[PDB]
Enzyme design. Structure first.
Site, PDB file in Angstrom:
ATOM      1  N   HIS A  97       0.809  -1.201   0.000  1.00 27.68           N
ATOM      2  CA  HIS A  97       0.000   0.000   0.000  1.00 27.68           C
ATOM      3  C   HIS A  97       0.854   1.269   0.000  1.00 27.68           C
ATOM      4  O   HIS A  97       0.327   2.352  -0.201  1.00 27.68           O
ATOM      5  CB  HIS A  97      -1.067  -0.016   1.091  1.00 27.68           C
ATOM      6  CG  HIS A  97      -0.640   0.461   2.428  1.00 27.68           C
ATOM      7  ND1 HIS A  97      -0.353  -0.378   3.491  1.00 27.68           N
ATOM      8  CD2 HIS A  97      -0.540   1.721   2.899  1.00 27.68           C
ATOM      9  CE1 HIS A  97      -0.088   0.366   4.556  1.00 27.68           C
ATOM     10  NE2 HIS A  97      -0.183   1.638   4.218  1.00 27.68           N
TER      11      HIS A  97
ATOM     12  N   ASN B 257      17.286  11.694  12.182  1.00 29.95           N
ATOM     13  CA  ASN B 257      16.432  12.844  11.886  1.00 29.95           C
ATOM     14  C   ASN B 257      16.233  12.926  10.380  1.00 29.95           C
ATOM     15  O   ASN B 257      17.209  13.166   9.646  1.00 29.95           O
ATOM     16  CB  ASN B 257      17.046  14.132  12.422  1.00 29.95           C
ATOM     17  CG  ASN B 257      16.076  15.275  12.387  1.00 29.95           C
ATOM     18  OD1 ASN B 257      15.379  15.455  11.398  1.00 29.95           O
ATOM     19  ND2 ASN B 257      15.976  16.023  13.487  1.00 29.95           N
TER      20      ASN B 257
ATOM     21  N   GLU C 283      23.753   9.016   6.331  1.00 27.20           N
ATOM     22  CA  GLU C 283      22.761   8.706   5.324  1.00 27.20           C
ATOM     23  C   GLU C 283      23.364   8.095   4.063  1.00 27.20           C
ATOM     24  O   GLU C 283      24.471   8.465   3.660  1.00 27.20           O
ATOM     25  CB  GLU C 283      22.021   9.973   4.903  1.00 27.20           C
ATOM     26  CG  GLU C 283      21.202  10.638   6.004  1.00 27.20           C
ATOM     27  CD  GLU C 283      21.941  11.675   6.840  1.00 27.20           C
ATOM     28  OE1 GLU C 283      23.187  11.813   6.726  1.00 27.20           O
ATOM     29  OE2 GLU C 283      21.230  12.351   7.625  1.00 27.20           O
TER      30      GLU C 283
ATOM     31  N   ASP D 168      -0.115  -7.506   1.835  1.00 27.06           N
ATOM     32  CA  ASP D 168       0.379  -6.133   1.838  1.00 27.06           C
ATOM     33  C   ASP D 168       1.901  -6.095   1.972  1.00 27.06           C
ATOM     34  O   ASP D 168       2.455  -5.808   3.046  1.00 27.06           O
ATOM     35  CB  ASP D 168      -0.311  -5.316   2.940  1.00 27.06           C
ATOM     36  CG  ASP D 168      -0.044  -3.817   2.830  1.00 27.06           C
ATOM     37  OD1 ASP D 168       0.463  -3.388   1.767  1.00 27.06           O
ATOM     38  OD2 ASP D 168      -0.382  -3.094   3.807  1.00 27.06           O
TER      39      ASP D 168
ATOM     40  N   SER E 150       1.724   1.359  16.323  1.00 26.63           N
ATOM     41  CA  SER E 150       2.180   2.076  15.142  1.00 26.63           C
ATOM     42  C   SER E 150       1.032   2.939  14.616  1.00 26.63           C
ATOM     43  O   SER E 150      -0.100   2.865  15.097  1.00 26.63           O
ATOM     44  CB  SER E 150       2.738   1.113  14.126  1.00 26.63           C
ATOM     45  OG  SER E 150       1.816   0.129  13.726  1.00 26.63           O
TER      46      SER E 150
ATOM     47  N   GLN F 105      -0.189   6.015  11.172  1.00 25.11           N
ATOM     48  CA  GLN F 105       0.041   6.569   9.852  1.00 25.11           C
ATOM     49  C   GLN F 105       1.476   7.124   9.749  1.00 25.11           C
ATOM     50  O   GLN F 105       1.946   7.805  10.660  1.00 25.11           O
ATOM     51  CB  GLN F 105      -0.957   7.692   9.587  1.00 25.11           C
ATOM     52  CG  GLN F 105      -2.390   7.284   9.164  1.00 25.11           C
ATOM     53  CD  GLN F 105      -3.316   6.645  10.213  1.00 25.11           C
ATOM     54  OE1 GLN F 105      -4.061   5.727   9.884  1.00 25.11           O
ATOM     55  NE2 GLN F 105      -3.346   7.171  11.406  1.00 25.11           N
ATOM     56  N   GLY F 106       2.161   6.796   8.656  1.00 26.12           N
ATOM     57  CA  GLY F 106       3.548   7.156   8.406  1.00 26.12           C
ATOM     58  C   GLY F 106       4.546   6.096   8.803  1.00 26.12           C
ATOM     59  O   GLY F 106       5.689   6.142   8.383  1.00 26.12           O
TER      60      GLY F 106
ATOM     61  N   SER G 154       3.738   2.909   8.130  1.00 26.19           N
ATOM     62  CA  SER G 154       3.423   1.838   7.192  1.00 26.19           C
ATOM     63  C   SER G 154       4.632   1.410   6.401  1.00 26.19           C
ATOM     64  O   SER G 154       5.440   2.254   5.969  1.00 26.19           O
ATOM     65  CB  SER G 154       2.338   2.257   6.226  1.00 26.19           C
ATOM     66  OG  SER G 154       1.099   2.361   6.878  1.00 26.19           O
ATOM     67  N   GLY G 155       4.745   0.102   6.200  1.00 32.61           N
ATOM     68  CA  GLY G 155       5.851  -0.442   5.459  1.00 32.61           C
ATOM     69  C   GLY G 155       7.073  -0.766   6.296  1.00 32.61           C
ATOM     70  O   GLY G 155       7.950  -1.499   5.847  1.00 32.61           O
TER      71      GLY G 155
END
Ligand SMILES: [Ca+2]
Length: 223
Positions: free
Chosen positions: A40, A54, A62, A84, A172, A174-175, A177-178
């Site tokens: 999704h 951050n 990074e 999913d 958990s 929203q945000g 996800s995954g």
């Protein structure tokens, strides 16, 4: 993540942020070239961001690597969220060291009662909205299949499990996800869905990664 804690920079070295101009989903690095996420979360133009703490400040660990290809599960159903899961291939291999590292796939499925670590940059409020910039973490148990089905009648497939706290307050959101659910050093879940966040009797629902190991391995081997 609602009701969690600040992980600490680079303490979850397999956690990635999927970026399309902004963070929109988590994922898990499973080898130098491949990330697991939720179907999704699919969209074109993904940049995978590894080594993040951050997500709004360049802090020095990074690696930003564009996706070359995404593969949504062949049987993903966006209405039910069954299956999913998706795979994302990086255009170049990530450099692996202690701050950027893959997470092992499971060899067997985890059991209800096992403790896991859930992480992400999603909303930290159950009512209203606040997005963290640093990675949040939550320790939570896998819940029984029977309590999962009783929480969400008619909605839990064999490719899903619940984890969290029926009392509410820790979940958990929203945000997230995954992103990963890791238990005993193995990726057992993917943040998938739930009713609101951190609501009483509405635990988080997670993609059951152990069901997908053969698909994951065979897909990587040919792509
Ligand atoms: Ca950063």
């Amino acid at each position: 993540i609602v009701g969690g804690y600040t992980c600490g920079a680079n303490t979850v070295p397999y956690q990635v942020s999927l970026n399309s101009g902004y963070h929109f989903c988590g994922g898990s690095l499973i080898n130098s070239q491949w990330v697991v996420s939720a179907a999704h979360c699919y969209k074109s133009g993904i940049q995978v961001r590894l080594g993040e703490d951050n997500i709004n400040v360049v802090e020095g660990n990074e690696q930003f690597i564009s996706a070359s290809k995404s593969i949504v599960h062949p049987s993903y159903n966006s209405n039910t969220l069954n299956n999913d899961i998706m795979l994302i291939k990086l255009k170049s291999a990530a450099s692996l060291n202690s701050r950027v590292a893959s997470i092992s796939l499971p060899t067997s499925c985890a059991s209800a009662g096992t403790q896991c670590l859930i992480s992400g940059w999603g909303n930290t409020k159950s009512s209203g909205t606040s997005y963290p910039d640093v990675l949040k973490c939550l320790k939570a148990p896998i819940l029984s299949d029977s309590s999962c089905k009783s929480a969400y009648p008619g909605q839990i497939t064999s490719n899903m499990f619940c984890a969290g706290y029926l009392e509410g307050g820790k979940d958990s959101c929203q945000g997230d996800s995954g992103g990963p659910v890791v238990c005993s050093g193995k990726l057992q879940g993917i943040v998938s869905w739930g009713s609101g966040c951190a609501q009483k009797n509405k635990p988080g629902v997670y993609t059951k990664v152990c069901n997908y190991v053969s698909w994951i391995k065979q897909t990587i081997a040919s792509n």
